[PDB]
Amino acid sequence: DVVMTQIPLSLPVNLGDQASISCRSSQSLIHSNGNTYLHWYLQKPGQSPKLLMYKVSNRFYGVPDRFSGSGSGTDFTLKISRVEAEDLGIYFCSQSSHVPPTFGGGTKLEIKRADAAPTVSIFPPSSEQLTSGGASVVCFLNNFYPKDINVKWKIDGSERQNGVLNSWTDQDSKDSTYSMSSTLTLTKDEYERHNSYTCEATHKTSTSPIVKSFNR
Amino acid sequence: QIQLVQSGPELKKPGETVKISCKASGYAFTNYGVNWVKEAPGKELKWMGWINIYTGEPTYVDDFKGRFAFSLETSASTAYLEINNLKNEDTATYFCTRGDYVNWYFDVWGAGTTVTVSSAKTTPPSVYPLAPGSAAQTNSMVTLGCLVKGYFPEPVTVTWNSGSLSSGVHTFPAVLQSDLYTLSSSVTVPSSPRPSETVTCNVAHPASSTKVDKKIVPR
Numbered sequence: 001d002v003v004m005t006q007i008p009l010s011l012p013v014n015l016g017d018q019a020s021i022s023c024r025s026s027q028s029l030i031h032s033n034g035n036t037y038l039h040w041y042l043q044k045p046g047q048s049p050k051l052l053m054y055k056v057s058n059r060f061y062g063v064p065d066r067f068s069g070s071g072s073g074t075d076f077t078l079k080i081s082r083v084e085a086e087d088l089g090i091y092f093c094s095q096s097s098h099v100p101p102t103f104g105g106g107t108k109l110e111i112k113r114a115d116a117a118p119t120v121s122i123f124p125p126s127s128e129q130l131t132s133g134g135a136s137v138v139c140f141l142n143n144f145y146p147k148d149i150n151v152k153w154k155i156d157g158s159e160r161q162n163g164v165l166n167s168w169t170d171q172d173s174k175d176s177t178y179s180m181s182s183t184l185t186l187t188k189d190e191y192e193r194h195n196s197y198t199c200e201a202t203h204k205t206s207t208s209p210i211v212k213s214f215n216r
Numbered sequence: 217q218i219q220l221v222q223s224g225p226e227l228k229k230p231g232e233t234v235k236i237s238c239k240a241s242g243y244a245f246t247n248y249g250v251n252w253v254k255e256a257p258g259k260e261l262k263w264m265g266w267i268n269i270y271t272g273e274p275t276y277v278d279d280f281k282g283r284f285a286f287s288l289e290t291s292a293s294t295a296y297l298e299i300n301n302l303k304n305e306d307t308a309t310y311f312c313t314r315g316d317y318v319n320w321y322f323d324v325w326g327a328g329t330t331v332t333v334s335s336a337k338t339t340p341p342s343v344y345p346l347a348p349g350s351a352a353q354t355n356s357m358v359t360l361g362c363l364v365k366g367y368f369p370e371p372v373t374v375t376w377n378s379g380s381l382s383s384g385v386h387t388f389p390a391v392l393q394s395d396l397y398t399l400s401s402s403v404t405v406p407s408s409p410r411p412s413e414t415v416t417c418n419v420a421h422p423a424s425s426t427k428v429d430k431k432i433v434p435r
């Protein structure tokens with residue numbers, strides 16, 4: 001049923017800049033009764049969605065003069081003039097021109113800033129854990145920009161695939177970066193039968209993909 | 217203050233059912249529709265279906281037949297979704313929204329109701345100290361951490377030095393390995409004094425009435 005497709009997924013913006021989110025429909029959104037039901041929502045963190053615009057170009061109440069909507073048939077665009085701290089959130093687009101309504105994946109408005117590199121730090125499975133028979137090794141991959149980064153856990157030559165749990169912070173409010181943490185977990189035993197552990201981290205910055213190891 | 221107010225967070229095993237309330241206040245209930253949307257973590261918001269409040273008949277999105285009921289109670293001005301016989305892929309937050317019959321949009325959204333479905337039993341965390349294994353090339357900054365392992369349900373709350381090593385801290389979102397939750401938190405101290413000054417992380421887990429303090433020590 002009419003698959004709504006937004007792109008980008010992040011839109012790095014400097015407050016003050018014009019932003020333009022955009023969305024695409026997989027059918028026409030012109031209805032038999034001559035009207036387009038493409039609506040846009042804003043969902044700020046852990047909250048409800050909020051109607052922003054009804055039928056392509058109409059502000060809902062509250063929504064400021066600063067927002068526009070346009071497009072036809074299958075293509076539409078949301079536009080903020082001076083973006084400000086109060087609009088950061090995920091913008092989604094839905095259609096009601098065809099049954100059932102559908103949403104699009106959203107694009108989150110992100111703050112734009114200065115490329116940062118991962119302060120990578122790597123830790124061996126402590127004493128307390130070893131006693132219980134397990135063994136997690138943990139790499140904090142911190143304070144970087146942009147968002148992609150690729151974790152490569154190589155234990156000697158043979159790199160491990162099957163034991164990773166990686167996680168992620170949303171943009172850090174204070175000086176806008178991201179942090180990540182990879183965490184490889186082993187049984188104590190496999191672990192004491194390898195000597196190296198390198199957190200190979202591949203962020204578009206340090207063309208020697210940044211590697212940190214401890215050898216048991 | 218025209219509202220759609222919803223019940224609480226619900227935590228059920230497989231196989232029991234759940235009945236979310238959605239109570240409208242301040243609007244002629246019968247002139248709008250109530251729609252239920254489900255946000256699944258990382259999945260798109262699926263509209264689930266609508267209930268027409270004059271006639272009383274549900275219109276299920278095909279994908280929801282069988283287990284998903286919609287019922288209401290118009291003196292009470294309340295709307296209900298009952299998911300009978302719950303299975304782990306349903307763990308989503310459920311919103312109810314009034315839809316406007318003219319412009320066909322959802323203009324008032326309800327707060328949201330999380331349903332967590334797990335067969336799990338309430339476990340205490342294992343809090344392990346993560347300290348540099350003789351690791352020096354950081355800058356004049358060191359990074360200790362705490363690895364909160366295997367708890368159930370959420371949340372835990374990690375602080376450092378009872379709330380006073382605040383900037384520098386980075387707690388990561390709980391990912392569940394194997395039926396249970398695992399999380400971690402790190403602090404970037406200025407090394408000028410550490411290990412000279414104490415650094416201890418403090419994990420409270422309310423759902424088991426467990427607080428744990430571990431001093432991070434060079435070894």
Ligand SMILES: C[C@]12CCC(=O)C[C@H]1CC[C@@H]1[C@@H]2CC[C@]2(C)C(=O)CC[C@@H]12
Nearest residue numbers: 096099249250251266315316317320321
């Ligand atoms: C679009 C539509 C889609 C599905 C359907 O069976 C009816 C149409 C027309 C009425 C719409 C409905 C979606 C839900 C709406 C928006 C409501 O809850 C009130 C008016 C309703």
